[PDB]
Amino acid sequence: GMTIKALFWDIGGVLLTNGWDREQRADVAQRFGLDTDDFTERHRLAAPELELGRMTLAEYLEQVVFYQPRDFTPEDFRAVMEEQSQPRPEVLALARDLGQRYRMYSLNNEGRDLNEYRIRTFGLGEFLLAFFTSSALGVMKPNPAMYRLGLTLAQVRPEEAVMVDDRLQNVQAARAVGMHAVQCVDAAQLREELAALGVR
Ligand code: NA
Numbered sequence: 001g002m003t004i005k006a007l008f009w010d011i012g013g014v015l016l017t018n019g020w021d022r023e024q025r026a027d028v029a030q031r032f033g034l035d036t037d038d039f040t041e042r043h044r045l046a047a048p049e050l051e052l053g054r055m056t057l058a059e060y061l062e063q064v065v066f067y068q069p070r071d072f073t074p075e076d077f078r079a080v081m082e083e084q085s086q087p088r089p090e091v092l093a094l095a096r097d098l099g100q101r102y103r104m105y106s107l108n109n110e111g112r113d114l115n116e117y118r119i120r121t122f123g124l125g126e127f128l129l130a131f132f133t134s135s136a137l138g139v140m141k142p143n144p145a146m147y148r149l150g151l152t153l154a155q156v157r158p159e160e161a162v163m164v165d166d167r168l169q170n171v172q173a174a175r176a177v178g179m180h181a182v183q184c185v186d187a188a189q190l191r192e193e194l195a196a197l198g199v200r
Helices: 022-031 036-051 057-064 074-082 089-098 112-121 144-154 168-176 187-196
Strands: 006-009 103-108 131-133 161-165 180-183
Touching: 006 144, 022 036, 022 074, 036 057, 057 074, 074 112, 089 187, 103 144, 112 131, 131 144, 144 161, 144 168, 161 168, 161 187, 168 180, 180 187
Parallel strands: 006 103, 006 161, 103 131, 161 180
Antiparallel strands: none
């Protein structure tokens, strides 16, 4: 087939843990003594706009946490949010290796502040050339438009690209715009499937 010219990488659940998923929020909420039902409902409402970069973290925190007096600060809270991010060593290592031979980019959903913390903390920029992130672009996976935008920014044809994501819905959406895609289950599996596409 066409030679692959670019890889697009999901970050959460692939390169790193998710930044602010259900399980993590549950944990952090407990630590801060938050009413979990109210917190979850408020997060549900506000999260998408944070993810799309149309509301600030301060704004989100105002609605989701600091809507009543608290015995801690937004800075305190933000610190603990940031700390939820941990590496996925084997996949990271694979990506770092491949980055020596291929042009690669992120295509991921994440609020700006957590995104930038994750990039700097884990040196994602050493192997990803650009970060096509929801909070920067104002669209989010699994919107077909996000995939198309990534392709447009990288200037590669759909068939010359491969999307790596842990969610089947995202893999399928990528394929629907003409991209190759592989669902990331584990490093060994991902390496083999990429190799099948000529990405070694
Ligand atoms: Na993911």
